[PDB]
């Protein structure tokens, strides 16, 4: 995927071609202003040296060479501000354009093309990939052009002044260039490698973090913790190897620089003494060529970024490329005028291209006229809602030709049409806009009186009165502060204000009441004369009162006719109607006390790394003083050789000490990180379930914490220590040496040291890897990104795209302008500090000349004070910019100690309480009231009760969200029942043993999630704290006939299972959770919906393997299908949590009650 170069800059205007051209010009010209600085420095020192030999006319010549230095300073000020500001502007504009256009093209797309795309990945796209395009083309091309200029100027100066030396410097410069390349590259790709190192274990944490209730429910904690440990240790080995190699490469860069000084001066003295050169030409040639070779390395990261951009641009410019078959926008679409209600289908088929192997609808030939209200009767399995979407031109039907009133849909406007067929779907969703905005999505132009009229028609207006700020009532995400019945009433209200030409309902009475349903159906019937309508509902209540009732079976229209026709027809509708009638503390060093030896060695080697800058100051300003003095050629030669060798030795000790400080602080940091992750996880797990379900303590929150804040705390301890001591060695010694050698210049230079430090930090913060803040502040246009994609479905309701493109435009055009202001600021700062470097030369050497011509100090002493304090301050900067922050890392450690301190209620590992010897198998609940403390505003269970006997297969029947699965959390002790008193065998579970209460019993959850293991480590997960004895494992697959599928799979007991077992089909996996609980041999088996997705003959075998032990072990089945309810022992009906009637199947059926109605779905 290569976008080359021309395609990459396609989204540009005139002004930006202009910005780029003036940019590279001012970058080439800010480039060549270091080598000219060394060309002046050469002759300046060549005049200081020879001056004071019979201080006449020194201060004059220095008043001249103050103007060369200050001139180049005030030329770089400008060239650098121009380069930075102008390239950040080219990029700013170009990325804004591409971002808005990407979002615009992501709302034009065939619904099928969202089968290919995803949700989380697509948000990764529209933030990470676009910021990655920005990253290259913004400034890396500036920095790249500037460093190429400094290289070529380095060579031109070094060949103008003297070649015989620049050839040697150059002939070892390939190794300098290469080592600079590797150093800089390692620096840019440091954070990215780390995440790659953590990937697996991180993904293993998320899975377990999400499904925590399950891995509680079995014995599975120790397994999940060892599982983690293994991949953690792999992250540690990869980590410390990376630390070793990072430091080797850095240490060898320094060794090579210093050995390069050694060669240059050992050769330069041969030349100087021979007569040819002087000390000025050698300083010039050497510094200019040495700086040029080193700079090229800085250019290399810029080259890699361009490869990254013109790669990611492939996929982004892809969504920009293709036009969906059914153009959602499409202004060329035909528009009808005399649109009378008609509906025409003929031999209609379709498959959801997410599965094109199965053709689910295998024929439909339908003709419906105006006002004709049609219902569709048939099981879940026929495919009504498929037709529903197919009508709205949300797809192309494959066979036949669908039309409406003469002309066909395939050639006419989809916005207009998708409109005039107003729909409500099965599970409509609620937006986090203002309530009146949700509604007004009927039209850009709507009046408040219309909203009032429609909400009094739908009769969803009482709760409209009840809420605060009757027309300002803020809903949150998804609309879950209020009820679900009101939620369906207002989805109704929306497809009502949409005022369509046809009204298509898909079960708009999901969890709604009766009287509101009747008023809603009457208000519907108010608009069913001139506007065609069709209802897709299982609730027969709003089904009987329509004109036509048609019958699906196997996705085909089998039974045709009106009500009476289906009565006399003996189809499916006949049987149906027949049976229906914070405070942060510092205690954090103590988390890493075990590693005192690494720290001792580390502080020692950091002291020495710090001191290695003043040692160079002295040695350098002495190998210069040698050529200033008046000596023999023998003394000049011997001292050149001695100081060359001291240059080599400083290099070697630099190598070894960097390698050690790096390796050692690295290894202590990795070890702290690993034990902190493992221990914070072992304390996450044992915590309760209330702590887990609590909002603000979620799966995203917790994985971010456990995958970052551990590494943050690592940063605080070791980094703070290494940087403080290295800097104190460096600059403390620079300034003390400086006061001793010089008594007047160091005082003037202390007034510049702060600015030099700041200059070093700003330069390194750039080359290191300056990132954008929007990637954290911008948040995703706020929350318009996720919402548009996540809740993409009610946008699969109407068009209402523009009203999202434009909300994007606002919430994204605000920060944009703040980014331009930030470009101007960063430009001025990055120029002003560099300019301060050049004016540092000028001020320090002019004052040095005034001191030297009054015999208060020498040229050795001024070259010492200069080099030591100035480049000591610069190196204080360059090193303090690697230091991780200390506000964040301290708050982070507060969070970690917070968790590692938290004491979960009723410790899962605890044997404290009551440990009984005799067990019977009774369960009794008395006035047990409960509400989930996570919902303090809705009380969910209002004090039910039960009585259980041995082997008593207790039927629990109710609705969805009203007390079928809430005893999973009362009996297995997740949420303590606040009101009531429970009797399991008459024994209070509040004193019982918890890892035994779940040890004794085992259930089949509402859904099984499985894991990253083998079926030998997935079923066998059914029991733990006991070895897997396979003669039990062989038969757990056998009792449920699931031994068949497994032995056919390769690696019969060792076939790989990926994440959540995404390989097999349902019929083999839902069999496994049962096979899971078959090795469990639970004395009480709380089964919930073991007949959701299974064949009817293996439902027999799971029920018999349940049955062949349904004696003697207490049983309880909670499900919809009556295949398990009539063969259950007792029944207890549920309606919003209240227990009304109980009893035997022959007793609750002799009375016509509610269970008479709960039989009436499909039995007959």
């Amino acid at each position: 995927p290569t976008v080359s170069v021309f395609s990459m800059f396609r989204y540009s205007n005139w002004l930006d071609k202009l910005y780029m051209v003036v940019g590279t010009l001012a970058a080439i010209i800010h480039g060549a202003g270091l080598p000219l600085m060394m060309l002046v420095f050469g002759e300046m020192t060549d005049i200081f040296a020879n001056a004071g030999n019979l201080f006449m006319n020194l201060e004059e010549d220095m008043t001249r060479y103050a103007y060369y230095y200050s001139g180049i300073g005030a030329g770089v000020l400008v060239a650098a501000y121009i380069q930075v500001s102008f390239w950040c502007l080219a990029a700013g504009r170009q990325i804004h354009k591409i971002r808005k256009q990407f979002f615009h093209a992501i709302m034009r797309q065939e619904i099928g093309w969202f089968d290919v795309h995803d949700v989380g990945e697509l948000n990764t796209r529209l933030t990470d990939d676009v910021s990655k395009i920005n990253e290259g083309i913004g400034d890396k091309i500036g920095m790249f052009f500037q460093s190429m200029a400094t290289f070529f100027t380095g060579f031109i100066v070094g060949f103008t002044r003297g070649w015989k030396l620049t050839l040697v410097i150059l002939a070892i410069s390939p190794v300098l260039g290469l080592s600079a390349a590797v150093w800089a590259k390692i620096l840019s790709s440091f954070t990215d490698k780390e995440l790659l190192a953590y990937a697996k274990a991180g993904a293993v944490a998320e899975e377990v973090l999400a499904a925590i209730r399950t891995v509680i429910a079995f014995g599975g904690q120790k397994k999940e913790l060892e599982r983690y440990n293994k991949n953690l240790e792999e992250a540690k080995r990869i980590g410390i190897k990376k630390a070793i190699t990072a430091n080797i490469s850095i240490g060898a860069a320094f060794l090579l620089i210093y050995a390069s000084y050694a060669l240059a001066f050992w050769y330069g003295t041969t030349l100087v003494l021979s007569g040819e050169y002087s000390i000025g030409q050698v300083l010039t040639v050497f510094f200019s060529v040495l700086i040029g070779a080193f700079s090229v390395g800085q250019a290399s990261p810029s080259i890699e970024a361009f490869a990254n951009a013109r790669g990611a641009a492939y996929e982004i410019f892809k969504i920009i490329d293709n036009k969906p078959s059914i153009d959602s926008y499409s202004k060329s679409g035909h528009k009808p005028d005399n649109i009378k209600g008609n509906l025409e289908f003929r031999n209609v088929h379709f498959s959801y291209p997410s599965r094109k192997e199965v053709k689910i609808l295998k024929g439909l030939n339908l003709k419906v006229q105006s006002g004709q209200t049609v219902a569709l009767v048939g099981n879940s399995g026929c495919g009504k809602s498929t037709t529903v979407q197919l009508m709205q031109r949300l797809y192309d039907p494959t066979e036949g030709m669908v039309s409406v009133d003469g002309q066909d849909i395939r050639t006419i406007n989809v916005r207009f049409l998708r409109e005039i067929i107003g729909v409500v779907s099965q599970e409509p969703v609620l937006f986090a806009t203002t309530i009146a905005e949700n509604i007004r999505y009927g039209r850009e132009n709507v009046t408040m009186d219309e909203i009032e009229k429609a909400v009094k028609e739908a009769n969803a207006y009482d709760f409209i009165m009840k809420l605060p700020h009757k027309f300002d009532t803020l809903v949150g995400e998804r609309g879950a502060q209020l009820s679900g019945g009101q939620k369906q009433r207002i989805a109704i209200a929306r497809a009502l204000v949409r005022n369509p030409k046809i009204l298509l309902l898909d079960e708009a009475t999901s969890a709604l009441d009766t009287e509101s349903e009747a008023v809603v159906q009457v208000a519907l019937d108010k608009a069913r004369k001139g506007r065609t309508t069709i209802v897709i509902a299982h609730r027969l209540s709003t089904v009987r009162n329509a004109d036509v009732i048609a019958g699906f079976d196997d996705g085909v229209i089998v039974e045709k006719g009106n009500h009476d026709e289906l009565m006399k027809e003996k189809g499916i509708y006949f049987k149906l109607v027949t049976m229906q009638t914070p405070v942060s503390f510092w205690r954090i060093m103590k988390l890493n006390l075990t590693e005192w030896p690494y720290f001792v060695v580390g502080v020692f080697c950091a002291i020495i790394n710090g001191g290695l800058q003043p040692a160079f100051a002295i040695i350098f300003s002495k190998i210069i003083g040698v050529f200033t003095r008046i000596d023999d050629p023998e003394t000049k030669r011997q001292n050149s050789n001695l100081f060359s060798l001291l240059f080599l030795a400083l290099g070697i000790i630099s190598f070894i000490t960097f390698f050690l400080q790096g390796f050692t602080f690295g290894k202590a940091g990795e070890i702290l990180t690993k034990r902190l992750r493992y221990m914070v996880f072992r304390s996450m797990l044992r915590q309760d379930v209330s702590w887990f379900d609590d909002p603000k303590n979620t799966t995203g929150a917790l994985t971010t914490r456990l995958a970052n804040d551990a590494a943050q705390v690592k940063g605080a301890i070791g980094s703070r220590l290494a940087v403080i001591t290295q800097n104190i060695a460096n600059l403390g010694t620079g300034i003390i040496i400086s006061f001793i050698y010089g008594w007047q210049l160091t005082l003037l230079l202390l007034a510049i040291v702060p600015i030099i430090a700041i200059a070093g930090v700003v330069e390194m913060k750039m080359l290191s890897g300056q990132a954008l803040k929007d990637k954290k502040e911008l948040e995703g246009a706020g929350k318009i990104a996720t919402e548009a994609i996540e809740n993409f479905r009610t946008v699969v309701s109407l068009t209402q795209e523009q009203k999202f493109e434009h909300m994007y435009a606002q919430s994204l055009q605000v920060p944009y302008r703040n980014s331009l202001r930030k470009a101007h600021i960063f430009g001025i700062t990055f120029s002003f500090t560099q300019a301060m470097m050049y004016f540092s030369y000028a001020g320090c050497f002019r004052f040095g000349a005034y001191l030297v011509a009054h015999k208060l100090m020498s040229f050795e002493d001024v070259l010492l004070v200069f080099s030591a304090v100035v480049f000591g301050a610069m190196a204080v900067g360059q090193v303090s910019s690697f230091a991780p922050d200390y506000a964040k890392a301290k708050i982070s450690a507060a969070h970690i100690i917070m968790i590692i301190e938290k004491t979960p209620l009723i410790d899962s590992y605890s044997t404290e309480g009551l440990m009984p010897n005799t067990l019977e198998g009774n369960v009794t609940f008395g006035e047990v009231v409960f509400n989930y403390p996570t919902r303090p505003d809705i009380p969910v269970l209002q004090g039910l009760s039960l009585e259980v006997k041995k082997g008593q297969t207790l039927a629990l029947v109710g609705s969805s969200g009203c007390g079928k699965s809430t005893v999973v959390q009362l009996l297995e002790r997740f949420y303590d029942p606040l009101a009531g008193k429970v009797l399991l065998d008459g024994k209070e579970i509040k004193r019982l043993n918890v890892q035994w209460l779940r040890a004794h019993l085992g259930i089949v959850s509402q859904e099984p999630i499985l894991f990253d293991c083998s079926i030998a480590e997935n079923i066998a997960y059914g029991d733990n704290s006991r070895v897997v004895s396979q003669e039990e494992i062989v038969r757990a697959a056998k009792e449920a006939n699931i031994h068949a599928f497994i032995e056919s799979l390769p690696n019969k007991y060792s076939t790989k299972v990926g994440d959540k077992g995404t390989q097999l089909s349902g019929g083999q996996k839902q069999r496994i959770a049962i096979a899971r609980a078959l090795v469990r041999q639970p004395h009480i088996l709380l089964l919930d919906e073991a007949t959701s997705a299974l064949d009817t003959e293996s439902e027999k075998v799971v029920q018999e393997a349940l049955d062949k032990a349904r004696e003697g072990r207490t049983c309880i089945v909670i499900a919809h299908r009556l295949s398990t309810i009539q063969n259950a022992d007792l029944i207890v009906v549920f309606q919003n949590g209240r227990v009304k009637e109980h009893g035997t199947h022959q007793q609750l059926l002799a009375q016509k009650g509610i269970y008479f109605s709960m039989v009436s779905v499909q039995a007959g």
Partner: antibody, heavy 119, light 113 residues
Framework: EVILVESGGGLVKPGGSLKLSCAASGFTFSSYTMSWVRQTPEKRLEWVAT????????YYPDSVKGRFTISRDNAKNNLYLQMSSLRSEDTALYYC????????????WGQGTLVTVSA | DVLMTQTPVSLSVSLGDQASISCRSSQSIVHSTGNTYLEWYLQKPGQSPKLLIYKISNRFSGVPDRFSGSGSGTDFTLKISRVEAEDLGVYYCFQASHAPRTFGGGTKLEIKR
């Protein structure tokens, strides 16, 4: 101009020891190489010792090594040569010396001081 | 090691003429660095020598025009043309390019009258 003037001198029995000085003024003493030079009774010069500006680089001819030790004080501008175990061939006249910047070896001879060793 | 002969020992010049002095070193005095150092110190009577010519052809600042040193390989001469009356004394050719820095012999200059 520069003046170098020395003292010391006189008469010392064989195997003796003494210390010739050389106070130099006028030329910022802490930079130049210095030398001693010796002129025997036949008016025939000879080199004796040299010390570099730093002070940590002294060169003596092959013969008179070990028993003569040259050194300097840069703070007071003085150059001392300390002689011991002198023979009967040490009767001489010793001069200081300076060092021309363009490689001219002895360029500013101070006045002489003479040293006679006899029983 | 390096020893320096000086060919004319005693010289009989007449005031107003040209005189020549020669200094032969065995061994081709030439340093490692590439120069040859060979001064021509001149001492008067009752005086401590003064420099006259350094690095074979140069003249120490403050010398007349007529002292010309010329040096080929291992033989070096000094020519005084138009001999004045304050140019009497003894000449010394001191070489410093090798390990014991010798001072050579000594040639005397007498003006006839």
């Amino acid at each position: 101009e520069v003046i170098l003037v020395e003292s010391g001198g006189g008469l010392v029995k064989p195997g003796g020891s003494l210390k010739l000085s050389c106070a130099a003024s006028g030329f910022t003493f802490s930079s130049y190489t210095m030398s001693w030079v010796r002129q025997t009774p036949e008016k025939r010069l000879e080199w004796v010792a040299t010390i570099s500006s730093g002070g940590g680089n002294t060169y003596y001819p092959d013969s008179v090594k070990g028993r003569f030790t040259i050194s300097r004080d840069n703070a007071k501008n003085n150059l001392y040569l300390q002689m011991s175990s002198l023979r009967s061939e040490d009767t001489a006249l010793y001069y200081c010396a300076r060092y021309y910047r363009y490689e001219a070896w002895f360029a500013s001879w101070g006045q002489g001081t003479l040293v006679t060793v006899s029983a | 090691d390096v020893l320096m002969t000086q060919t004319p020992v005693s010289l009989s010049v007449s005031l107003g003429d040209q005189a020549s002095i020669s200094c032969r070193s065995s061994q081709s005095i030439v340093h490692s660095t590439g120069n040859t150092y060979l001064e021509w110190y001149l001492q008067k009577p009752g005086q401590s020598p003064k420099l006259l010519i350094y690095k074979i052809s140069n003249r120490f600042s403050g010398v007349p025009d007529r002292f010309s040193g010329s040096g080929s390989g291992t033989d070096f001469t000094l020519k005084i043309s138009r001999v004045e009356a304050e140019d009497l004394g003894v000449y010394y050719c001191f070489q410093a390019s090798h390990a014991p820095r010798t001072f050579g012999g000594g040639t005397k200059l007498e003006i006839k009258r």
